[PDB]
Amino acid sequence: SKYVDRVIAEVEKKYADEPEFVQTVEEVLSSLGPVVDAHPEYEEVALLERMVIPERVIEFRVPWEDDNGKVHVNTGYRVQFNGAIGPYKGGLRFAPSVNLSIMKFLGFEQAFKDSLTTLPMGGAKGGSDFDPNGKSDREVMRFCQAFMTELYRHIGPDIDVPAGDLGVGAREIGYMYGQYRKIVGGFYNGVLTGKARSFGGSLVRPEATGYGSVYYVEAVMKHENDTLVGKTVALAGFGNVAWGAAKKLAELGAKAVTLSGPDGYIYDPEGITTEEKINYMLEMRASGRNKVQDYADKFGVQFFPGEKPWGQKVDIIMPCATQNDVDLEQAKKIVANNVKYYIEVANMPTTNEALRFLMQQPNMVVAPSKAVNAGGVLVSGFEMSQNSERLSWTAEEVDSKLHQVMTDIHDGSAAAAERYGLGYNLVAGANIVGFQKIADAMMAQGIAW
Amino acid sequence: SKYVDRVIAEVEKKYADEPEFVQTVEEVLSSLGPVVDAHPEYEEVALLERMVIPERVIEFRVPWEDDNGKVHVNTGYRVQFNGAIGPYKGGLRFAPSVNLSIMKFLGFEQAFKDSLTTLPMGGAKGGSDFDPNGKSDREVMRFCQAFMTELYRHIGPDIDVPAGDLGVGAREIGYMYGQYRKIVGGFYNGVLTGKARSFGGSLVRPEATGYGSVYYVEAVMKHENDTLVGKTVALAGFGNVAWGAAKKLAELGAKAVTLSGPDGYIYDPEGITTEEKINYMLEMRASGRNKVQDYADKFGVQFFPGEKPWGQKVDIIMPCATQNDVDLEQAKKIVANNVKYYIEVANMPTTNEALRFLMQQPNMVVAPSKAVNAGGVLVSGFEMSQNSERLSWTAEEVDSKLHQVMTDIHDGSAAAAERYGLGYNLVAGANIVGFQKIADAMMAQGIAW
Amino acid sequence: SKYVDRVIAEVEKKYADEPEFVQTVEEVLSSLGPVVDAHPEYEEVALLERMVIPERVIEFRVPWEDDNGKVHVNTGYRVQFNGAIGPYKGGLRFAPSVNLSIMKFLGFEQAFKDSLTTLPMGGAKGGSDFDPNGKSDREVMRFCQAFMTELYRHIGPDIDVPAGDLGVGAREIGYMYGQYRKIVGGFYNGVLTGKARSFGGSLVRPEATGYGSVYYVEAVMKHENDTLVGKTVALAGFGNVAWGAAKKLAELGAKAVTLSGPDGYIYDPEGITTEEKINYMLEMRASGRNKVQDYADKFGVQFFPGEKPWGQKVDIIMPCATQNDVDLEQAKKIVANNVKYYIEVANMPTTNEALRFLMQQPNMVVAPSKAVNAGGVLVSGFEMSQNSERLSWTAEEVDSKLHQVMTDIHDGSAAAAERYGLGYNLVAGANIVGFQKIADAMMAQGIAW
Amino acid sequence: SKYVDRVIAEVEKKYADEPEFVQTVEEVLSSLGPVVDAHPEYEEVALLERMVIPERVIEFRVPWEDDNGKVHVNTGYRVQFNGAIGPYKGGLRFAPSVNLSIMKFLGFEQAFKDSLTTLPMGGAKGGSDFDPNGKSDREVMRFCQAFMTELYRHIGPDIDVPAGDLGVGAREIGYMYGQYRKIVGGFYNGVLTGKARSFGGSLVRPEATGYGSVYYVEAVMKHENDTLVGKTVALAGFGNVAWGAAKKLAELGAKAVTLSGPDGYIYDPEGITTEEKINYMLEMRASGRNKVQDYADKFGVQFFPGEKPWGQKVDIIMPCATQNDVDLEQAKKIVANNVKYYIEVANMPTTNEALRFLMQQPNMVVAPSKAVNAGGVLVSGFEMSQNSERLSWTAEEVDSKLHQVMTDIHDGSAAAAERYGLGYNLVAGANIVGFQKIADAMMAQGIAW
């Protein structure tokens, strides 16, 4: 696209100093050519130009006291990127590496991923260069309060709803929430997501990701006049996602037959489908042993040190662990086995080489982690609904909506790809669907933002 | 607990002029040692010391004119005790006896009770020393208006939601509400509970306490590997609570065999199980005669002047009228008949002594009124949810919710006591459960409040 | 007045547990019959009955951490007594003795006093049971921050403006202010008085009380067809008040002949009239020794251990130190020397008895401390005006204003007593004047408050 | 200073990407060692670390429509650097080069500058990358409206008061104001300075800078036991600043003998001391000829094409035009002429090399532009005052105040430098006095900001 290309160039020049942000913009816009080309009206209202500039950026000073009475100062950021479709929403990262470029790129991606969920959620990102590593509980507490003392005025249940991320967990969330409540003098607990159950957190949080991934695979199966029952799945990891996935597959008639730790991997032909087997997974995460072999020990199964489960012949490939777990050569094995379903779960588990690769393959079904792992985001939106309704949903109610929306996600992606004649391209469809809802709202909304 | 003991000590010293508040604290905390004993972290952050002091207290002047044009002045209160788990919530009492001691004592309890419902509700209590008895409708209107003219600024749907109590009913709630919406200039109907259906009240209000009590019982049966079928019950009172209780027991297959009034008790061995019988209760209440004898003269049954039915032989005891209805005397009568189910419904229908006594009773199942009569409170939370959703639920939906919650309440109480190594002690269970949630919440929220 | 008597009665009954408040009411109202007797309209609208009840009272929890990381909890108060003539105004006291009784009693007086200044200022009083003695600077900072985190919402430049008092000085005011501006996110520096000059404090703060007292006196002279020239004065204390008083008397041509300390008194017949003499007072105060004797050892003058100077012969008596400094004993000494000018400066430097006694004294002119020491208060009002104007006045401008106002105060007091047919009674004058303005205001404002 | 050194280095590593800001910090901080050295407590509270991070930064998207209906997008900024001593205050710049670094460096300087005026004003800077070059009035109007649509929420009379700067004059100010007043629904005209008189602008705006500089010189004179009577002054430029300086100089008995333009200079040994000559300047400014020669032509005085007036023998040198007017070469000319008074008027009219140098001359008086040219800032502060007072000051009143404050700026500057043993160093004195008021306020305010 001419417009696309032009916009990218401008950004390249204007934000040469925010490299992360720059890369992200390129990558994103690069792949909307068609959609844009199909929409000349966008250009007349400088839609893309508006899109690449956050609606509002907030930076602020954060002075805080350590345990020895020593004074420190950090910087706080809150980037409210896009709010056309819902309140701003997005995590807070506390890490020494935090800067505007990082916040911008993260916040830009955020709007897209949130759009995709089908829920009314805008996109934002925030954080601080504060380094939680090595700090006492009390110190984290003090920092969190100082942080919120300024932050509070820029957010709210109908404005901006933050959540955790690198460095920000349930504990920080609780600390920020206490400070918020005190300042504002009311409850307004939906101002934050990722809360403990005692003050409004949601049921099904842990399982959310693994479960959601399975429900997505199901919609794929359905699309293809196929089914989950009887399917074999190759997983990576033994962590939370892998666990949720394993449990939900079993429950649906399918079965996971591999897992992988740093040590290599296990192969369970009977499937990781028993109560014991599935919880034992909880066991190991806990232990700390980073040893995928504990399973092989416990259960009497094949352990494959310095190995990756990608050589195994299964029906479904589902990497739930590390980044770049599937490389060019790993993918080759997968294709040699003629596997038809490649479902990304973890973030960026596939190399680009790999990705372009499997991507050529005419027989295969490739699904992007951003649509596939959206369960986590969904449950945070549910938390919001529950807080607004002033009641808690049962775990069955939560699971239900999760199933339902994940289905909408798969389907919406596919229809979009089809609309722009790409066929059944799930990777592209995800990109397109998030973008389009945003574009449509902005168009209907006129030139204000 | 030394901690507990000590904290208790301090309160006695510091609030010597607040006799009521002092007792309550005493009574409630003394009962928590084991929880406290296992939660060493609580102390480090002065948990109990903070809990005993209300977050915020408000008192204000209330001048008002009478039908003669004469001016009067009263004082209004609002104690916002704890809002860690929800917005402040608690009724308003208009009685000449009203003072801060009383407000504080009710507010303190209100929070534990509110916590136990499983809904996101805080604790508060307010009212005035105004005396509505003898006042014309218009004077009552004038008073409510003046009262709200100041109060409005301290409350709100997401802050503090009051309700009625001694002296405060629907009429008053209506007047207060009319003034609030006029001042604020919006709807915000969830600012108060106990409203008429025309401007947001819930269905099932009247049946509420009565029904939840039974649902509570039902959960007891189940625990006990038992059933409601063919059981007999001894009820005290003939009011709205007794009436709802009777209705439902009957639908459940059990039967109420006693009623009670200020003039003695009645005996009806066939059981108060017919429409006609049941509806008679409402005529009785409506007449305002306060004579339980009219049932007896109507239906031709046994009538025992000057006596409490605490001597009849039944499976289940349910005091639904007054305070310290049951005494050691009447306690003995009961045990003597070896009855195993003692279910307080009314507020404190038993003397602390009768209470111990009953508890010692190795065969008996004793249930606390604060857990048991929680249906009136649940219904007010549902009223809030419906106002938030901008729609009305059906009586069937209310009822079903009521039903699931009551069960959870019983169930939660049981595992709490269960966790403390106290067994099936529903009395301590109710305490421990309410406290624990507040503690968890305050703990996660840090030192802000 | 029967009205008065009756109202007094009710207060005693109703607030029996508020001994301090009860006295004050008693004392203040008993003194107003004639005003009340001539204002029949007051009764019809229940004027006194409303006045005795604060418009609004606030109490709140204040948790704070110490240098060790140990948590403490205190209670904060803010009584907003009367705002009919200006925003609420009154200091904050941090003392272990703090309770509602005390807050109420100070708040009640604060309003009369504030009314008498002729400036548009209401009455209020607040504080905490926190005890600053023994606390590190940082702990004090932490406490102030916590205290303001809640208070902020109840105060403001046009609502309620607090100041310092026992336990609350510049340091504290600074900490409170830093927290306030951070929370509110604006300047609004007129929210508090007694601020350092760097962020809005006034010039002439220290001299204030001392100077106004003299200006007050000057107005007495004038009334009396007299002069300050060549008069001698007996001062008590050597602090900031005594110092300002001495300075100015001296500029006015009169002379201070006594000083007093906890260790006795001094006699300096030449008069404390030189720069060196006068500045010595500041070194003395600064040393923190609390020995009036150092003046004597320095300047070589008379020194009377264990004695009050109330026995020296002078034209004018000005107690500037403590409470119930003057007694019947010392009263006699004075009268005996036939001294005609008794000017309270310090707060209640006299026993009610010594007080009557003096008043009976047909030749004497007795002046009340609340009228006389009003300069400290005037200066805080000027601080407010300067903050509102966004500029600083010169010491000359402050001083001149101070000067005109003090005169009006004396003059207004005189015509008030004058109007009641009590003659040159400046003690009743001060009462009547303060009350009258409040009454007129509340009368014009209707029954709202 | 080791602390200072340490701070400067961190900013350098940290903000490498904002060279202009990095550069200003080093320059300002490096000139403060002695105050710092004298104040070890600053370092304990991380004072300098805090000062270098603005309190709050806001960036926002600005979409706007041109006359042809084409849509444009720009970025809006507002850096609220420091508000310890007053509401944030600082101008807005509309230029294509605007970016954060730029905004930060200017807002940082602004704090020190505002501090130094003695008025209660914080420091801030804002603007947009919008290019007013070539925009119709209507487009400018539209941009201003869009800009203020988001900005309004972050400013206000007691919060942040912007003003003009490069690209923002009375036209823009008026457009922004109309939009503000419309959104907020009230007057609040003190939200912006530089307003037209019709809606709250102040008299004496144009003369302010010129007049104020003369008032400052008058203070130097008096400190040096000299007078302005009889002095000849060499001015640079013929604009507004030069014009006001000349007029005030004449009034006070001195005389300007030179004016300069890009064309060379004129010498009027008789003095530009007549209404005709003075007003002529005005006509020269308007003409658009941009030629100093016009004056020579008009009044028959000497014109020296291609030259600067720095070789003329005069008593006082006052550069009122370009930055870097005076270089090492020109400075030697002055030194060589044995001139004692060198008064910078325009911003940075002296090169660093030249400044240093002049600074080494012992017989000289060197005054920084930052203090001398403050008359402009002062009258904006006076605008705020009149707006709060709801009235307009007469030109005399304004002039009178300007006069008084200017003297205070000089004297305060002198006092500071000397308090640090620098003698009569007006250059460092300005630095120290600005910084000092801020440091003091921040220390008193605690660890909030």
User: Which residue among B17, B45, B71 sits closest to C45, beta carbon to beta carbon?
Assistant: B71
Q: Which residues partner with B62 through β-bridges?
A: B74
How many residues would you count in chain A? 449
Q: Which residues partner with C91 through β-bridges?
A: C163
Structure tokens at A271: 């499937």
Residue for token pair 């306030």: C180
Non-local (6+) Cβ contacts of B199 within 8 A are B174, B177, B189
Residue C186 to chain D, least CA–CA distance (Å): 4
In angstroms, what is the C-alpha Rg of chain B?
22
Q: Tell me which of D13, D104, D125, D195 is the catalytic residue.
A: D125
Count of A–C CB contacts within 8 Å?
15
Assigned domain for B200 exists: no
C-alpha to C-alpha distance for C164 and A236, rounded to whole angstroms: 66
What's the one-letter identity of residue A157?
A: P
Structure tokens at A283: 């066991």
Residue of B nearest to C53 (CA): B61
Pair A181, A306 in one domain: no
Assigned domain for A197 exists: no
**Residue C326 backbone phi and psi in degrees, to 5:** -95, 130
Residue B358 vs residues B27, B326, B421, C436, D204: alpha-carbon distances, Å = 18, 11, 20, 65, 90
In angstroms, what is the C-alpha Rg of chain D?
22
Any alpha helices (H) in C234-374, and if so which ranges? Answer: 240-251, 275-287, 293-299, 328-336, 352-360, 369-372
C-alpha to C-alpha distance for C71 and C49, rounded to whole angstroms: 42
Assigned domain for D333 exists: yes
Non-local (6+) Cβ contacts of B5 within 8 A are none
Contact (CB<8Å) D388/C392: no
Residue for token pair 């043993």: D421
Assigned domain for A33 exists: yes
Which is nearest to A80 in space by CA: A61, A114, A110, A54?
A54
Contact indicator for B295, B318 with CB cutoff of 8 Å: no
Count of B–C CB contacts within 8 Å?
79
CB neighbourhood size of B153 (10 A):
15
Residue D188 to chain C, least CA–CA distance (Å): 14
What's the one-letter identity of residue D378?
A: L
A chain contacts of residue B446, beta-carbon cutoff 8 Å? 141, 144-145, 174-175, 178-179
Pair A265, A320 in one domain: yes
Assigned domain for C414 exists: no
Pair C71, C32 in one domain: no
Pair C223, C183 in one domain: no
For position C135, which CATH number holds?
3.40.50.10860
Residue B37 vs residues B2, C338, D145: alpha-carbon distances, Å = 9, 73, 63
Q: Which domain holds residue D278?
A: 207-373
C-alpha to C-alpha distance for B318 and B260, rounded to whole angstroms: 11
Residue of B nearest to A179 (CA): B448
10 Å CB burial of residue A222 (0-12, 13-18, 19+) is middle
Residue for token pair 């168009």: A443
Angle between helix axes C19-30 and C2-14 (nearest 10 degrees) is 180
Assigned domain for D406 exists: no
* End residue of a domain, out of D350, D373, D396: D373
C-alpha to C-alpha distance for A408 and A93, rounded to whole angstroms: 30
Contact (CB<8Å) C69/A138: yes
Q: Where does C208-254 show beta strands of DSSP type E?
A: 232-236
Query: Residue B300 half-sphere exposure, CB side, CA atoms within 13 Å?
Result: 0
Q: Which residues partner with A163 through β-bridges?
A: A91
Pair D113, D165 in one domain: yes
Pair A215, A357 in one domain: yes
How many residues would you count in chain B? 449
C-alpha to C-alpha distance for D205 and C424, rounded to whole angstroms: 55
Residue of C nearest to D87 (CA): C187
DSSP codes, B74-89: EEEEEEEEE-SSSSEE
10 Å CB burial of residue C39 (0-12, 13-18, 19+) is middle
- Helix, coil or strand: residue B428: helix
C-alpha to C-alpha distance for A62 and A147, rounded to whole angstroms: 6
Pair A218, A346 in one domain: yes
Chains B and D touch (3+ CB pairs under 8 A): no
Residue for token pair 């009777």: B246
* End residue of a domain, out of C373, C408, C439: C373
**Residue C127 backbone phi and psi in degrees, to 5:** 155, -160
Residue C139 vs residues C72, C168, C171, C444: alpha-carbon distances, Å = 11, 14, 12, 47
Q: How was this structure determined?
A: X-ray
Pair B26, B67 in one domain: no
Residue C247 is among the residues annotated as catalytic for this protein? no
Contact (CB<8Å) A60/D63: no
Contact (CB<8Å) D83/C181: yes
Contact (CB<8Å) B53/C72: no
Pair A368, A245 in one domain: yes
User: Which residue among C55, C56, C71 sits closest to B45, beta carbon to beta carbon?
Assistant: C71
Chain D adjacent subunits, 3+ CB pairs under 8 A: A, C
Q: Which own/partner pairs from C35-41 qualify as long-range (CB within 8 Å, at least 24 positions apart)?
A: C35/C420, C35/C432, C35/C435, C35/C436, C35/C439, C36/C1, C36/C3, C36/C4, C37/C1, C39/C439, C41/C443
Chain C: residues touching D (Cβ < 8 Å) = 141, 144-145, 170-171, 174-175, 177-179, 181-182, 185-189, 196, 198-200, 387-392
β-pairing verdict for C88-94 and C160-163: parallel
C-alpha to C-alpha distance for B379 and C271, rounded to whole angstroms: 80
Residue C66 vs residues C70, C136, D389: alpha-carbon distances, Å = 5, 9, 45
User: Which residue among B118, B440, B446 sits closest to A145, beta carbon to beta carbon?
Assistant: B446
Contact (CB<8Å) D61/A73: no
Residue C389 to chain D, least CA–CA distance (Å): 5
Residue B48 vs residues B13, B23, B34, B42, B401: alpha-carbon distances, Å = 16, 16, 14, 8, 33
DSSP B201: P
* Positions at the binding site of C: 89, 110, 113, 164, 209, 240, 380
Assigned domain for A420 exists: no
Pair A240, A306 in one domain: yes
Cα dihedral sign for C81, C84, C88, C89? negative
The number of distinct structural domains making up chain A is 3
Contact (CB<8Å) D444/C188: no
Chain A adjacent subunits, 3+ CB pairs under 8 A: B, C, D
* End residue of a domain, out of D349, D373, D397: D373
In angstroms, what is the C-alpha Rg of chain A?
22
Let me know the angle formed at the C-alpha of C226 by C225 and C227, rounded to the nearest 5 degrees: 150
C-alpha to C-alpha distance for B254 and C54, rounded to whole angstroms: 56
Contact indicator for D346, D320 with CB cutoff of 8 Å: yes
Contact (CB<8Å) C175/D119: no
For position A26, which CATH number holds?
1.10.285.10
Pair A368, A251 in one domain: yes
C-alpha to C-alpha distance for B114 and B124, rounded to whole angstroms: 10
Pair C18, C46 in one domain: yes
Assigned domain for B100 exists: yes
DSSP C201: P
C chain contacts of residue D378, beta-carbon cutoff 8 Å? none
C-alpha to C-alpha distance for C12 and B443, rounded to whole angstroms: 44
Residue for token pair 């299964």: A314
Contact indicator for D330, D354 with CB cutoff of 8 Å: yes
Residue of B nearest to A145 (CA): B448
